[PDB]
Amino acid sequence: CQPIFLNVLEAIEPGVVCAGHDNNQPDSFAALLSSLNELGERQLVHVVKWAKALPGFRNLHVDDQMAVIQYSWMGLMVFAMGWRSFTNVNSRMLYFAPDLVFNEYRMHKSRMYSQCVRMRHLSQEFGWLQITPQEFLCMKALLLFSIIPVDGLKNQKFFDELRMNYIKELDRIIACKRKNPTSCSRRFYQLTKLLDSVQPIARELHQFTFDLLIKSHMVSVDFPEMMAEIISVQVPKILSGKVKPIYFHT
């Protein structure tokens, strides 16, 4: 039998995205954050192309298609960055981009050291849990469907159906080489715990970027127009509790 679902996820996975950072200049808070913001915008372009090509994504109302991307991009990007960090440098540094790698000095200079260490821990877990490339792909897709509005989406039913199907695919990937139900259960527990761990990190980053945008003119940090829009219009909905992550565990 052909692994149709996984074939698609591998086929649509975005390639390498560079930040455009000048590594020849001494590190500075303004330059590092301005580059992270530019990287955010560049990756968002790829996240949109990727999301729109996901199995069943078109089943969603168009307004919901746009909403889920605008609410989940932080978690999606952090998860992918953690995977890059693990695969490329064994979690020794945060591999935001080939031209924007953070050692501890840069983590400190960025003024979000605590968040960076939590992301480094996330990266390490990909190794400790022996996450396979296929589990990574399925989990990342699930992250796109893990944050929704309290007031409900345009067509909440279509979204619930799609999320359920992605969870089913994750079950299938776990069962592939596991014949015992207990072994599958243990793996599902591990993976859902890992997925949940992305949310608190994403919220801390949402808070940090929101505060940074508000005082950006005072610290010389540049925000691309689109990022400024999303962080001032969508992110506050999350921070004010109107849009919340779907946790597997409490």
Binding site: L44, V45, V48, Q65, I69, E225, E229, V233, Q234
Partner: peptide
């Protein structure tokens, strides 16, 4: 929003 919507639309 507008900027994102335009991106999303292509």
């Amino acid at each position: 929003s507008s900027r994102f919507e335009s991106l999303f639309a292509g």
